[PDB]
Scaffold this motif. Sequence first.
Motif, PDB file in Angstrom:
ATOM      1  N   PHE A  47       0.739  -1.227  -0.092  1.00 31.59           N
ATOM      2  CA  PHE A  47      -0.154  -0.007  -0.088  1.00 31.59           C
ATOM      3  C   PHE A  47       0.810   1.243  -0.062  1.00 31.59           C
ATOM      4  O   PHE A  47       1.923   1.251   0.849  1.00 31.59           O
ATOM      5  N   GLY A  54       1.295   3.907  -7.148  1.00 32.95           N
ATOM      6  CA  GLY A  54       0.302   4.132  -6.121  1.00 32.95           C
ATOM      7  C   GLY A  54       0.633   3.202  -4.784  1.00 32.95           C
ATOM      8  O   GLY A  54       0.114   3.175  -3.854  1.00 32.95           O
ATOM      9  N   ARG A  55       1.721   2.223  -5.030  1.00 35.34           N
ATOM     10  CA  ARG A  55       2.410   1.402  -3.834  1.00 35.34           C
ATOM     11  C   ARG A  55       3.376   2.215  -3.374  1.00 35.34           C
ATOM     12  O   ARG A  55       3.581   3.627  -3.604  1.00 35.34           O
ATOM     13  N   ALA A 101      -8.034   4.970  -1.469  1.00 40.37           N
ATOM     14  CA  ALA A 101      -6.916   5.393  -1.832  1.00 40.37           C
ATOM     15  C   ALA A 101      -6.693   6.366  -0.485  1.00 40.37           C
ATOM     16  O   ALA A 101      -7.636   6.769   0.293  1.00 40.37           O
ATOM     17  N   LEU A 139     -10.887   5.778  -8.291  1.00 38.98           N
ATOM     18  CA  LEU A 139      -9.816   4.948  -7.732  1.00 38.98           C
ATOM     19  C   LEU A 139      -9.369   3.995  -8.821  1.00 38.98           C
ATOM     20  O   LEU A 139      -8.369   3.230  -8.352  1.00 38.98           O
ATOM     21  N   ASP A 140      -9.994   3.692  -9.881  1.00 44.60           N
ATOM     22  CA  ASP A 140      -9.509   2.766 -11.055  1.00 44.60           C
ATOM     23  C   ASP A 140      -9.922   3.505 -12.174  1.00 44.60           C
ATOM     24  O   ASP A 140     -10.642   4.605 -12.437  1.00 44.60           O
ATOM     25  N   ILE A 191      -5.180   7.530  -8.883  1.00 45.86           N
ATOM     26  CA  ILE A 191      -4.134   6.777  -8.067  1.00 45.86           C
ATOM     27  C   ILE A 191      -2.616   7.216  -8.655  1.00 45.86           C
ATOM     28  O   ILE A 191      -2.619   7.095  -9.966  1.00 45.86           O
ATOM     29  N   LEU A 196      -2.481   4.176  -2.848  1.00 43.24           N
ATOM     30  CA  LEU A 196      -3.419   3.045  -2.839  1.00 43.24           C
ATOM     31  C   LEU A 196      -3.525   2.604  -1.096  1.00 43.24           C
ATOM     32  O   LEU A 196      -2.415   2.348  -0.631  1.00 43.24           O
TER      33      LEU A 196
END
Lengths: 149, 149
Positions: A46, A110-111, B2, B102-103, B109, B147
Amino acid sequence: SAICVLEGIVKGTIKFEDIGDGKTHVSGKITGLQPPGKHGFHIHQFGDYSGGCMSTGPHFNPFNKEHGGPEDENRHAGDLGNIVSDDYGNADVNIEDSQIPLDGPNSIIGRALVVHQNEDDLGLGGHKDSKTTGNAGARLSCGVIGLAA
Amino acid sequence: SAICVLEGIVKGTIKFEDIGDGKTHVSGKITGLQPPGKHGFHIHQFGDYSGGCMSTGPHFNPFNKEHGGPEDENRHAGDLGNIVSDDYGNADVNIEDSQIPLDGPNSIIGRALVVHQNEDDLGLGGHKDSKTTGNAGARLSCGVIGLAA
Ligand SMILES: [Cu+2]
Ligand SMILES: [Cu+2]
Ligand SMILES: [Zn+2]
Ligand SMILES: [Zn+2]
């Protein structure tokens, strides 16, 4: 392209470029990395450091394997191995890898990137936690991995 | 889900939840936001603050429109309007919007959230830059959008 500004004790901007393939090249200058020697270096699940580096969760593991080194087949996609700091705490990152793409269902955008206090034993230390975290120990710094120009 | 940890002068953790639809809900407590009153609040194109908030680039604009307010049709997807700080610099964020998913190909993201020194005039200030940035002025803080669990 993607990019990571490190937050925490250890400082640095880590760039990510599709190389590519296939492979992405990760580089940048790191400072404050003590003590000198090898430190575990990993993409975690995350991109959340709201609760400290702890909130980035476990190693990024899309293909559901055990912890290993970057050259093992049995390896988390997030397992980038160790980076090395010199006596002054400075390290240069220069790694190529093919399980950390900048798009697709298994992208790392986004990680989080995390750097650790200890050496990552690459899953060979025969410790309780060798096969999950590499016994890499404390999270010194983390950065969210961001979309860059 | 997120999440954004703000870096810079203004502090706070901003969460993003699919609500959903459709719509995403953005919330969190912000402190250090001076002076009191309205401040522009926007998702920008790149999740890169390596060079300061300036490196996040222009407003996130996937549908190629002019700057406006969150309720205009003629509006950047990243145009979240203004948030409000009280006399002590504290603000509560609570916004719902349907252009910040968010996707998908137009996800946010890995982009950046930015909060500004001035009021965003919502594209109605008749200033040189009204129709691009809302004349919102300086970038006080930014965070990469990550994320989260
Ligand atoms: Cu790690
Ligand atoms: Cu802005
Ligand atoms: Zn691992
Ligand atoms: Zn705008």
